Design a protein around this ligand. Sequence first.
Ligand SMILES: CO[C@H]1O[C@H](COS(=O)(=O)O)[C@@H](O[C@@H]2O[C@@H](C(=O)O)[C@@H](O[C@H]3O[C@H](COS(=O)(=O)O)[C@@H](O[C@@H]4O[C@H](C(=O)O)[C@@H](O[C@H]5O[C@H](COS(=O)(=O)O)[C@@H](O)[C@H](O)[C@H]5NS(=O)(=O)O)[C@H](O)[C@H]4O)[C@H](OS(=O)(=O)O)[C@H]3NS(=O)(=O)O)[C@H](O)[C@H]2OS(=O)(=O)O)[C@H](O)[C@H]1NS(=O)(=O)O
Lengths: 104, 517, 103
Amino acid sequence: HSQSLDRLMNPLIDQYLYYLSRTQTTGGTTNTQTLGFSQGGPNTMANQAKNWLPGPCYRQQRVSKTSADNNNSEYSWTGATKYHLNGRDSLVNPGPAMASHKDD
Amino acid sequence: VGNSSGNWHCDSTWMGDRVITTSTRTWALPTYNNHLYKQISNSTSGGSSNDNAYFGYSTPWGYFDFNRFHCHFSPRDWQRLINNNWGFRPKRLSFKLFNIQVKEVTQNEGTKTIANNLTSTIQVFTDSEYQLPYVLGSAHQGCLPPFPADVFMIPQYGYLTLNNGSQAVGRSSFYCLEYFPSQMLRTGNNFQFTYTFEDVPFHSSYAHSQSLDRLMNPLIDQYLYYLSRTQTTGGTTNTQTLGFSQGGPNTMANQAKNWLPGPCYRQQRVSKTSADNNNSEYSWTGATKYHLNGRDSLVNPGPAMASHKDDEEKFFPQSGVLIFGKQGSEKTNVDIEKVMITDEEEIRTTNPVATEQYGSVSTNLQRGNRQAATADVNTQGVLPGMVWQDRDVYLQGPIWAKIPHTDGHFHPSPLMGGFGLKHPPPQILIKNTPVPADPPTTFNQSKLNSFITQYSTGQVSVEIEWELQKENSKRWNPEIQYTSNYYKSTSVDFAVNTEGVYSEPRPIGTRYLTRNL
Amino acid sequence: LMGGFGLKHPPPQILIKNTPVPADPPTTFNQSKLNSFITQYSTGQVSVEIEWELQKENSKRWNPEIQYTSNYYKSTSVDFAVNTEGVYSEPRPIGTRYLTRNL
Ligand SMILES: CO[C@H]1O[C@H](COS(=O)(=O)O)[C@@H](O[C@@H]2O[C@@H](C(=O)O)[C@@H](O[C@H]3O[C@H](COS(=O)(=O)O)[C@@H](O[C@@H]4O[C@H](C(=O)O)[C@@H](O[C@H]5O[C@H](COS(=O)(=O)O)[C@@H](O)[C@H](O)[C@H]5NS(=O)(=O)O)[C@H](O)[C@H]4O)[C@H](OS(=O)(=O)O)[C@H]3NS(=O)(=O)O)[C@H](O)[C@H]2OS(=O)(=O)O)[C@H](O)[C@H]1NS(=O)(=O)O
């Protein structure tokens, strides 16, 4: 896909929907409890309202191809994600579908 | 030039099983980006964090957005639909663009002169193949206004692509809108376009009159037992035992059930009275937010869940609701009397409260020495046997959203409410065709950057046929209808004030009529 | 009570307005409704044809009746005509009850 599921908006227009933006009066010396609402916009793309959510997850342990970056322990079986079935554990491999790593 | 292209149709027609709502409006289209496609990023908008980072393009095109219920239904029509029908869904749409005028404004010597250019055109195409980034359904502004008397300006089309901060990745795509077959229209020409909606489930515009955990016969016991007592009650030395009771009209909580409440993703509970909230800035810290490719995004409004329990109107989930803004309300840090927070409490019958644990699960194996421990389930995905209701619709809220083209989607109903469509009404894009100013008298290979300043106006109609599902309630006592309160006010609700400013005082949902579970 | 014909379905009201024509909008999108318009007004002609049914007088009276007549005496200006400045004026209110009939 050439678009990210969390960036399907129009970057030039704001929304007509608000979100809890500020919870505390900002400064004075004595900033207290308040409730401020902002409209999602091209600068707050993370706070905007979305219609969809990312696919399901079953977290995995992250190992590095450069063995010097990994913890010095035998976690091939201990730190693995594994389902339990009738009293015995099995490796979730390759498991359900998920991205391998973040950017860079 | 001297003959109108169309007429003004802006009324609804009720034919018993269906309603056709037409709505004409007058628009204005300026020239965007001065006819240029500009690359935009979070750095051009003044830089941001990594969560707000983006990379997209601005285009010279505007687009029509009639994806809101108030563009079609009047407050009265909406009330006549909400009080009598159990469900409704759209069947066919019919967009028309006419009475086009391309005015040419020439600002010379402080004196502005606006004259019509009869030979200038506008290009307008509709992406029926969904080859362009679909932008509608993100709840943006620029809709046909709700009141038919006013004229609106057409929003600017711009799309986003993949990014790595403010930069573009390999897969980032650039779509030229000029590479599609538009349709040049001079004054005198009109644009007609028809569309028929796919088969989508009716929107359940009723509340349930029974709770999903009270679907038994309160006079009869069950023939099924449950662990009732684990310890002999008293003596002095009460010891381990096992007693079983039969669920009955007094133990309704222990009875056996066939179904479970809809899924959950717990939200933080804030009070409308700021004195009841913790004194900290948790707008972003205490929020529920999904992680995607290393950056966090607010789950808002998130999936469908009840707002509060019984007798707790003051509390609302932090993100779990749609918050509209009253008329003229600003854009940033506006206070709570400037917004209208929706109340999704009519689904407490099937859906769990947005601000409470879903359930409790055993976390260990009780034994002679180890005792029974249990945990609170904050996030609970679907399970066989679950049943839930979808978010309401809101005469000010969205109508549909395009279901993302993925190979996997569960219950593709939009989280903001509405109808999830795989082939939603296409995006009608429109721009003013460029008209160059006098070119040099000697050839210059450089593209012409001097243009005649102009903008176009005209009318636009949008007719939608909705299928209704009439209410056949065999209930005995009266139901709960939406009604304008009879008390005398300064100004009528859903009417213009003394200055000609139309305002919708409150957010109207659909769930008024009740039905059994 | 003011006279005339009481109708349950009277000639409908013909309403007419000039369609708004917005002045040049901003070059950046503003959600606010456009309040700047091109000043204009329209003119033109209007005709109204009405067919009236009459009920002719069949008086079998012997002596002459009372007709509405413009008094024969010489005036400065004709009645129901324009004065020397082009201003039309109706000098008196004319009713219908002139012809007599038995009860
Ligand atoms: C944090 O870890 C530490 O604590 C946890 C528990 O605490 S916690 O929950 O709060 O975190 C410990 O984990 C629990 O206990 C483990 C353990 O004790 O090893 C282990 O228990 C399970 O397996 C145990 C051994 O089973 S076996 O089949 O491998 O042998 C078992 O205890 C044994 O019970 C058997 C039994 O009752 O049968 C005993 O066998 C004896 O009797 C058998 C039959 O008797 S009969 O009369 O002849 O018929 C004979 O056949 C056998 O020869 C005889 N053995 S003998 O040597 O005494 O002669 C055996 O001796 C016991 O050790 C547990 O059962 S139980 O009986 O103790 O209740 C069994 N779990 S259970 O049955 O579900 O209860 C588990 O990993 C775990 O179980 S738990 O109940 O979920 O907690 C952890 O070990 C401990 N580790 S530490 O931190 O490093 O110190």
